[PDB]
Design an enzyme around this catalytic site. Sequence first.
Site, PDB file in Angstrom:
ATOM      1  CB  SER C  90      -4.741  43.640  61.235  1.00 55.13           C
ATOM      2  OG  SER C  90      -5.255  44.273  62.502  1.00 55.13           O
ATOM      3  CD1 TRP C  92      -7.968  46.867  67.093  1.00 53.97           C
ATOM      4  CD2 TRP C  92      -9.130  45.265  66.168  1.00 53.97           C
ATOM      5  NE1 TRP C  92      -9.136  46.826  67.499  1.00 53.97           N
ATOM      6  CE2 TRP C  92      -9.854  46.009  67.064  1.00 53.97           C
ATOM      7  CE3 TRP C  92      -9.678  43.880  65.482  1.00 53.97           C
ATOM      8  CZ2 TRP C  92     -11.439  45.696  67.218  1.00 53.97           C
ATOM      9  CZ3 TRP C  92     -10.940  43.731  65.772  1.00 53.97           C
ATOM     10  CH2 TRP C  92     -11.885  44.672  66.435  1.00 53.97           C
ATOM     11  CB  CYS C 194      -9.517  53.661  83.311  1.00 52.19           C
ATOM     12  SG  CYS C 194      -9.123  54.268  84.744  1.00 52.19           S
ATOM     13  N   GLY C 195      -6.083  57.760  77.332  1.00 49.14           N
ATOM     14  CA  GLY C 195      -5.605  57.675  75.783  1.00 49.14           C
ATOM     15  C   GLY C 195      -4.461  57.063  75.786  1.00 49.14           C
ATOM     16  CG  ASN C 312      -4.630  53.902  60.011  1.00 49.11           C
ATOM     17  OD1 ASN C 312      -5.554  53.778  59.282  1.00 49.11           O
ATOM     18  ND2 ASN C 312      -4.358  54.015  60.935  1.00 49.11           N
ATOM     19  CB  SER C 314      -9.238  61.905  42.812  1.00 49.45           C
ATOM     20  OG  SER C 314      -9.931  62.468  43.517  1.00 49.45           O
ATOM     21  CB  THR C 330      -5.705  48.296  59.981  1.00 52.86           C
ATOM     22  OG1 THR C 330      -6.832  48.906  60.491  1.00 52.86           O
ATOM     23  CG2 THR C 330      -4.748  49.052  59.639  1.00 52.86           C
TER      24      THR C 330
HETATM   25 HG   LIG Z   1      -7.582  54.792  53.615  1.00 50.68          HG
HETATM   26 MG   LIG Z   2      -1.571  46.906  65.789  1.00 52.24          MG
END
Ligand SMILES: [Hg+2]
Ligand SMILES: [Mg+2]
Lengths: 416, 411, 396, 405
Positions: C90, C92, C194, C195, C312, C314, C330
């Site tokens: 990752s 991040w 400031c 999506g 990202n 059952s 992640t």
């Molecule tokens: Hg997942």
């Molecule tokens: Mg990334």
Amino acid sequence: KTRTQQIEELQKEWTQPRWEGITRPYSAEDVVKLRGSVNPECTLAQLGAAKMWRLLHGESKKGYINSLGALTGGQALQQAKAGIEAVYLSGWQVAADANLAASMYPDQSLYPANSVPAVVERINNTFRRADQIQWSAGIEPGDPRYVDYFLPIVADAEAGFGGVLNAFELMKAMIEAGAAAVHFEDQLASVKKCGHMGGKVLVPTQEAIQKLVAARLCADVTGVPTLLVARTDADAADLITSDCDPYDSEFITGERTSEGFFRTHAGIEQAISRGLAYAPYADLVWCETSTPDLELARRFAQAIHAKYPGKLLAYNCSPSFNWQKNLDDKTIASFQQQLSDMGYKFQFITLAGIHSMWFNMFDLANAYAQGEGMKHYVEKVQQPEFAAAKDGYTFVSHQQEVGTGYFDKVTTIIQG
Amino acid sequence: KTRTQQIEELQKEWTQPRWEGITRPYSAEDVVKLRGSVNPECTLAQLGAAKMWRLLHGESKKGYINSLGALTGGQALQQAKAGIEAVYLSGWQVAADANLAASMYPDQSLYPANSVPAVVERINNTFRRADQIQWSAGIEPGDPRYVDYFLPIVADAEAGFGGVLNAFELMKAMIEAGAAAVHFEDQLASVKKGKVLVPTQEAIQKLVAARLCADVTGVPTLLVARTDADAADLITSDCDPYDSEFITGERTSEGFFRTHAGIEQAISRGLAYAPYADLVWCETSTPDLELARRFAQAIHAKYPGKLLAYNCSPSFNWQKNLDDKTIASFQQQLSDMGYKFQFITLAGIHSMWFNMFDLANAYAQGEGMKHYVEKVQQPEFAAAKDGYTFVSHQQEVGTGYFDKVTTIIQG
Amino acid sequence: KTRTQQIEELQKEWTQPRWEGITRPYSAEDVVKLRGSVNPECTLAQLGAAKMWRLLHGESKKGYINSLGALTGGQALQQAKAGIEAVYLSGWQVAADANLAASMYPDQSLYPANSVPAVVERINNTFRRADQIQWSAGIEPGDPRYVDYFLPIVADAEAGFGGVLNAFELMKAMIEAGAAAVHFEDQLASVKKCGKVLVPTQEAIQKLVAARLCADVTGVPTLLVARTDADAADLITSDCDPYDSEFITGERTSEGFFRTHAGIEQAISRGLAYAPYADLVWCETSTPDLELARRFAQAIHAKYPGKLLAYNCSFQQQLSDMGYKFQFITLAGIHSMWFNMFDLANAYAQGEGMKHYVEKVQQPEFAAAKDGYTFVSHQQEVGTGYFDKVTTIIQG
Amino acid sequence: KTRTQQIEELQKEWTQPRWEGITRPYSAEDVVKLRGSVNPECTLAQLGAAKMWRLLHGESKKGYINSLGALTGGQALQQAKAGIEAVYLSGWQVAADANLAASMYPDQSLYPANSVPAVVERINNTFRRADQIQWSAGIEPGDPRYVDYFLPIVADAEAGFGGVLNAFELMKAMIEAGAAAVHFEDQLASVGKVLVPTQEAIQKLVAARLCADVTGVPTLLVARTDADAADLITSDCDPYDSEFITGERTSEGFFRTHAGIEQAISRGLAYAPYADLVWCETSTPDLELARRFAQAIHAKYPGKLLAYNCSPSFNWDDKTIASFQQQLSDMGYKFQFITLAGIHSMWFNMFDLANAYAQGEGMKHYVEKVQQPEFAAAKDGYTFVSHQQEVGTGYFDKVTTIIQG
Ligand SMILES: [Hg+2]
Ligand SMILES: [Mg+2]
Ligand SMILES: [Hg+2]
Ligand SMILES: [Hg+2]
Ligand SMILES: [Hg+2]
Ligand SMILES: [Hg+2]
Ligand SMILES: [Hg+2]
Ligand SMILES: [Hg+2]
Ligand SMILES: [Hg+2]
Ligand SMILES: [Hg+2]
Ligand SMILES: [Hg+2]
Ligand SMILES: [Hg+2]
Ligand SMILES: [Hg+2]
Ligand SMILES: [Hg+2]
Ligand SMILES: [Hg+2]
Ligand SMILES: [Hg+2]
Ligand SMILES: [Hg+2]
Ligand SMILES: [Hg+2]
Ligand SMILES: [Hg+2]
Ligand SMILES: [Hg+2]
Ligand SMILES: [Hg+2]
Ligand SMILES: [Hg+2]
Ligand SMILES: [Mg+2]
Ligand SMILES: [Mg+2]
Ligand SMILES: [Mg+2]
């Protein structure tokens, strides 16, 4: 490849001529057990070691390889364009202006142990870019302008930065970075004695030998026939850290210093005894020198060769002295040729790159700072560059030299 | 020192002469809320900025500062010993031979963003060693043999390597390493096909982000606004009405908009960046006096006395013409136009690479030691009279200094 | 190997099943001209790529690969020991606690561009060590206790840190360090106002191409994952690409960005445009939603049946049935690390220090031994026994 | 500031309580001559050294400082939020998973010497970020929710990676990165363990003290001895060691000595006057064993600060396990720490999580093993639940906001 298969292939390789006269105190099975199941290829190290071995055995242009210390990838690049056949990477130069602590240091192993391998990688990366530029322009090996950029790199490993495991890890880093040869020395710079008739301190012969064995083992594990240069500082060191090795007893005086060091009889005899002891464990023997004495060179060479005929030797100079003060001009001129006829096939000026760089900046700056700045830049740099074009210098076209043409082709293909 | 007192200080500092004619679109209070309860000192950055300011306002020896790009601490040290007053740190040289990816690159922002700062630290560390050697030997400021090693460092921040926060983080790295001045450009090298500009307001925001970082750290770092508009005939977008007079309306396949490259565009950007920067620079490929006079006249018709910066690479065979007389007085004529900071960006790499080539081409042919003696050692001995001390190489890197440290420890 | 010969080997390899359905806008000749006369081997990258491919095409233990984000070589080590088949790296996590600027950052591509490749290198180095320890102790491949430590590493190249050349250089770094797969995204994280803000479709495609070209030049069949953030991004940098016109409303922001209609329909047009240039397609999401997952998958498979997808995170088996063969959380490694550090330290700081260490860590480690956990013997885990052998061999 | 003023201030400072009982074999003039005309400030180092000193002299919460080995800035962060007052930075953990050679190594000084200082910098940067977030949210010293993020960092310099100059440079890098305290040992891992002559060990302690004095920062120096388990010594050059030297030399040329608490005590007493804290490394946790050392140390140096460690390679009665650190505190062990707490916490938990997760029903175990417990912990001060905020997204949003007007 199966383990047993790896053992058999090594056993067979050690019978090849490359390893003639080389001693290994361990077996092939010892080597293979340290490898792991996957052994990553080190392409540049393989190529450099093979090339260096050939240049030292009849393929050099002049019968000998003469080098100059380089501390940047770009300095090495210009050497390759000028016709140099191997790059010398000095630890002293790295300490002063190219180490990972980003500090200026004197030559006492004060920088982080991975600094030289970092410079080795810079040099190889520069070489790769030049080769790419050349290849993408369609200039192929065997062309009226085809420069072979991959010069073998000889790198300074000082005393391994500690014990045998430290030397083992440093050797590994040198190889992974693409060095073609590495040199280890027998003085302990970290404990150089201060004051009182002090100076460099040697380690017992046995300890210096274990470091050479540690470097050979790492090389064998990786599977690359890296050249090992054994250096001795015994010509000038009159101190030893210990008397544990009976082989050194003849040079031990009996006197002790306050640190616990033992005094020894320094000189060519001690240098010869270290040279003989390291010879079977190294591909090249180097006896550190501080003056340009052809007679001493002959004596040292004759002594090593009486026992190991044909043994390859290296010869250095910093240079710390004024050669013209010590010798006449004709001897200065034929110095390298005379050495070669004695068996010194690898010769080098350790601090040439730093003297070259620092002096030329000073010279340009000094005139520039007083005025008429552009005229000085024109007379000291641009005019000389244009004149050098005839000789192969292409940096006059600075954008191309660094890959501008190469990346433009990349760009064009992507948006193709 | 508390928040209110910090706010109070800033407000007063901004009324000092250092900040005359400088616009900041934010408040002292905005600055202080970004600082934290502890703000580490940046001694080298502080000294270099104050010195650089003084040199630009009367304390320089010749009336102007002339610099040469350096790529190793050692090149800088030699410049300090030769009388140079400020060090120029070129991004082109770093890309070519001194970056953190350990690779040789063309000048298109390919290296890792923390590379120039790493070189700044190297340089300042070299200077710290030289100063210690000098001081240990008993030579202090005032002493006629004293050499002031802390030359202000002017560093290349390209376009910040991303958006405003990237630029903010780069400025910060620059200051903590000790740079005295930093330059930012309005082209977007990550797309050099010719050069491409970003909208005027985007360029200004990067300058603002840099100034904000400096104010947060509390150091008066000099900000150099550079424009590549003299050679850029493409703009990324038409979002800024300030750029409309140069936008034709035509858009290329990449979506870029064609503009008119020239001093007119350069002048427009210079005028807009002026209120935000300490120095204004219009990048040139052709060292041309009339062009330079035209740019300076323009800027000065609006901001009298604004300090300008002038560079040159320079291009091959540029002198190929100007008479030798124009070549020699070139820097003095510029200074009279207002260009107080002049620099040859690729001097260091040319100096280094050519001399290595020259030495090595001769050495590889034979009679090796003769060439080394004739091209290096002899000239070195002759320069000793001028202040070159590297003839004694062990002292230069600190052997004497460290031997003394060893001695103090052992006894 | 000769230029022409190299060109021919390339033409032939592009006819192999590994490349079915992959588009390349350039020729083999183009690839070969950028190589140089010497092309260093990248052993770990080759092995990683070959293995990740095989795992995605029938060799995983469960028909799907589930990974957990790791930020240290040691974390990856424990995953290999516990049975995980692929390591997820990752960006991040790197930005927060493992980048070359040595700083803590939010996820806005603020760190130095060679930071992820540096962690890829650390992970591979930790794996080499574990392998050396195992091999030196006799345990050879095929042994009833032999652990295959070389797990394919999936790494985040974000948006490539700039233009096509920076992505190219980033891919080179990933490969040299030994990554098996790399993911590129279509948002511009350095501009989150400031999506999220997308780039025109053609721009995101140029980066996938640059990435694939570098892999082709190196000769490694690295897996390329095309990621789209279009499900939640309602802003785009420019309207230059005709392909995006239907999602562009015409409204423009103060920054000059164009508002767009975000949602699964936007994600599907990006997914479809990237499909032919990538080995895996990934539409980033935040909450587990099988119906949404089923819709994205049906839409891609209507044009590219068989296309592998990444998910990202059952539940997992249906996803797998839908084509989501590579699934992962992640931020697991950092939540795992920071939480447990807090837990342990919170109690420790209060008192009864050794009691808390024994109950929160020692006891549990002991119970772990039975499941393949070996760090209870930490001197050995880190290679004390391997270097002991090196020492012994050197000294006799 | 003048050379003379510098020497004068330096002398007056050496008479201060901070320095009672501490010996310096060099003069103030020696210090100043090594400084240079410009001496860059080391703010974080100054703050951490002062704070560590205060903690050790009454300002700690429990009367003693108990730490845990941390190898990432993030781990340190969580320790600060958890109430820990000092960060311990283990070289062992650095060798295994956080060194500059990017390799996993055993603990034998094999990593690049600037590796630990690099981790100190990471930790201090993380703390700077956490402090900025707080301050930018209006929270200030005195606010019921204000957290003091700048914990003093105790850092492992091993044996200095070479001779006295390596030790000097190492110390310089530790201080510039912002460490508050540094530990040096007398064994030679590079070479059971082998000790160095007492005078050598002491020379490193002086090298470190000298650098700190030149920098002008009152850094804390911890002298560690490994003589409790070291039966070998490299040389017999130091008469001070003569009584432990048996006479039997080894094949390496090393000499045998009499290992035991008696050896540790003499090293302990020999380093005392040069260090701020004394630490006699230990493998097995014996209170009686620890009581003898402490008392023995205090006979000659009353109230000398002592440090005590636990790997724990061990396998620790519950009542004694629970009062353990309370008892040591009573003996004079004010700085206690579990060196590898950090790496076991990290590696075990990733194993625990991955193990469950790899079998099947993954999402399930992740929720049960990490997510649920995180929400439960929010109550006790854990804030990583809001992960975007923890890393500074809110701080950078303010920056962006000020910039774009
Ligand atoms: Hg997942
Ligand atoms: Mg990334
Ligand atoms: Hg390799
Ligand atoms: Hg001495
Ligand atoms: Hg090796
Ligand atoms: Hg011996
Ligand atoms: Hg010799
Ligand atoms: Hg020479
Ligand atoms: Hg600073
Ligand atoms: Hg800042
Ligand atoms: Hg705009
Ligand atoms: Hg211009
Ligand atoms: Hg110029
Ligand atoms: Hg490679
Ligand atoms: Hg590539
Ligand atoms: Hg477009
Ligand atoms: Hg989705
Ligand atoms: Hg500092
Ligand atoms: Hg220092
Ligand atoms: Hg001694
Ligand atoms: Hg003890
Ligand atoms: Hg403990
Ligand atoms: Mg050397
Ligand atoms: Mg530039
Ligand atoms: Mg340790």
